[PDB]
Design a protein around this ligand. Structure first.
Ligand code: 86Z
Ligand code: 86Z
Lengths: 134, 134
């Protein structure tokens, strides 16, 4: 019925079918949505998560081509706060399953899923199998 | 003004920013367009072009998430024919610069561009530079 603002965030390094399926799932949680995607900065990613191949600019420019994405916040904050949700009038945070306990308490948490084995790194492995060990 | 059917085709193996930028360019050739994207079959790709990492199903399922894509023909014919254009009411073929001489004669050819250095294979190279030769 009414339009619902959905927020999802992540690194989106080397975007693959698994990311795109997650975004599609967040986008379709309700009939009418605006999906805002938050892309994490290079420094914080490396400091808290580990290695990141593509810069912030590249990760963001790729996401702009995904049909489910309605707005991008780049860089986004590393931690979602209740004031961040207020600022951008966000109704739900979409994320895959506690740092989100407060989101669930407020009724603002919606789960989405991973798809294993569709990743960019996985494809390089399929390339190398064509080259037997001996 | 009027709606214009654009056709672009290719392998779309390991879809990257370079593919997505090409699609965006085809999609925006005119104000109002329908972009049909043709995805080549596995056999013909291997027989005429060479190695292809992802199957037809995977290459197609990824393209479905790109915002510029309005319809996918999967598999598409390896060679575009004047009867193929008639069948799908195609006004222009979008492709990067003769097998397309007849397209240009008919006023149905529109050039688009590559973006070098944005490829999936290129990113694996950036990963490995973190591992000095010695
Ligand atoms: O990819 B992550 O686990 C992450 C980190 C901070 C904010 C959002 N996502
Ligand atoms: O990627 B290709 O050069 C190609 C081959 C046949 C039809 C369309 N594109």
């Amino acid at each position: 019925s009414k339009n619902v603002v959905i927020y999802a965030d992540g690194v989106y390094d080397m975007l693959h079918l698994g990311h795109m399926k997650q975004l599609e799932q967040a986008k379709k949680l309700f009939e009418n949505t605006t999906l805002i995607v938050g892309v994490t900065s290079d420094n914080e990613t490396k400091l808290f998560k580990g290695q990141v191949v593509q810069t912030l600019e590249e990760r963001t420019e790729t996401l702009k081509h995904i049909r489910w994405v309605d707005e991008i916040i780049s860089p986004c904050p590393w931690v979602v706060t209740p004031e961040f949700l207020e600022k951008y009038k966000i109704d739900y945070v979409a994320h895959d399953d506690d740092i989100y306990a407060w989101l669930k308490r407020a009724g603002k948490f919606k789960a989405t899923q991973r798809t294993e084995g569709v990743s960019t790194t996985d494809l390089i492995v399929r390339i190398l199998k064509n080259y037997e060990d001996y």
